Amino acid sequence: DSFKILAYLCQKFLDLHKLTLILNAVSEVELLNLARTFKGKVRRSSHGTNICRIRVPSLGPTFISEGWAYFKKLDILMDRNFLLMVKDVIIGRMQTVL
Amino acid sequence: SLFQNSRTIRNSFKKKYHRELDDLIVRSEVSSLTHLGKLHLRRGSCKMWT
C-alpha cells in the first residue's frame, strides 16, 4: 500500500529529472543522446534554436526550449525554477517515505 | 584555495581558459570510472596483510 505511492512518486521524480537534464543541456550531442535515451524528438526552429518534444506518462507531451517547458494536456508554461521546486518537493516526499 | 566557482574564475581571467575547464570536468570522471573498473580484474591476485 506504501510501495504503490512510492512508485508513483518515483515515476514523477524520473520524469522531472529527465526534463531537467534536457533543459540544462549545453550542447547538441547531449540533447540528442538524451532524446535517444528517453525517447524524445529534437526539431530545429528558424532562429537557430533547438526544440525537444518528449512524452512522459505523469505529465503528457512536453516541449522544451531555452529553459522553458510547455505541457499541452496540462496547458502550463514553466521556467526552470518552478520545475526544480516541484522536483525538490517530490524528492523530499519520496525520500521521507522511503 | 578560495576560487571554487567557475563564474568567478571565467570572468576573472581570459576566454580560452574556459575551454580548458569543461574538459577537466569530464576528464576526471573517466579517470575515476576506469579506475573503479580496473579493480575487477585484479581481484584474485592480491594478498592480505596482518
Next chain:
Amino acid sequence: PEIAKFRITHIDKLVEDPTSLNIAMGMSPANLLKTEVKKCLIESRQTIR
C-alpha cells in the same frame, strides 16, 4: 592499490594533504582546478593591481 613511480611533482600532495599516498589514479577535480588557478595567477602576475 597500485602505486606510481615517484617524481618531484608529487611532494606538493604530501604537503597539501598529508596522511596520503601517491597512487597512479587520476587527480581529483579540486586539485586540477587548483592547479589551473595557480597557472592563471602565475601567467597574469603583472596586470594585477
Next chain:
Amino acid sequence: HEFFEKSLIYYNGRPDLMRVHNNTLINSTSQRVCWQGQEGGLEGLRQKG
C-alpha cells in the same frame, strides 16, 4: 547607523522604476523599491554587537 542613515538602498531587479536625482535614486512608480538612508539594520551585519 551613520552608514545606514547616509547610504542608498536599492533592489537590483527593477531599475525600470528608479530615476537619478542629484546623486541618488528616486521612485517613479509608487512602488518604493529604493530609498535614501535609513536607521535600521540588515541581515548578517552586526549580529554579534
Next chain:
Amino acid sequence: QYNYFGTFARLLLMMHDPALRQSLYEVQDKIPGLHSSTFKYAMLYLDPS
C-alpha cells in the same frame, strides 16, 4: 539507508551522467569495467584515501 540511497544514486547516475554527456550503459569499450560487482562496492564503500 546509506547503502540503499547510495545504490539509488548510482542507478540515477548510470541513467545519465551530465559530465560525460551520455549514459553509462552505452559505454563498454572506453570504460569497460562497469556492470561489475566490484564497481558497486567501490562506488559506495571505498574511501578516497
Next chain:
Amino acid sequence: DNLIRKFNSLPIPSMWDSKNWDGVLEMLTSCQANPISTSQMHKWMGSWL
C-alpha cells in the same frame, strides 16, 4: 507573465521585450498554446501531486 502576454496581443515593459524569446514564441505557435495566467500553477501542483 510577460512571456504569456507577449505571446498574446498584450503589451509588457521594455525589460522583457529586449530578449531573444522569438524561438519560444515560435514553439508555442506550433503547438496551439493556451497558458493559465500564472495564478493557477500552484493550484495545479496541488492536484498533480
Next chain:
Amino acid sequence: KWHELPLIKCFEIPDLLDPSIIYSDKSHSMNRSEVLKHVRMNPNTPIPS
C-alpha cells in the same frame, strides 16, 4: 560610570596577510557612480553584482 573612564587599547588586531580570514567567494555591490551610470545607460537590465 565605567564607560566615562578614559579607556585605552587592550586588544591587538591580527596581521591579515593571508586571505581566507576576510575574503571569500561571494558577490557584492558596486560604487554609487557606476550604479547611476548603468541605470541611465542600461535601464532595461538588472543592476549586476
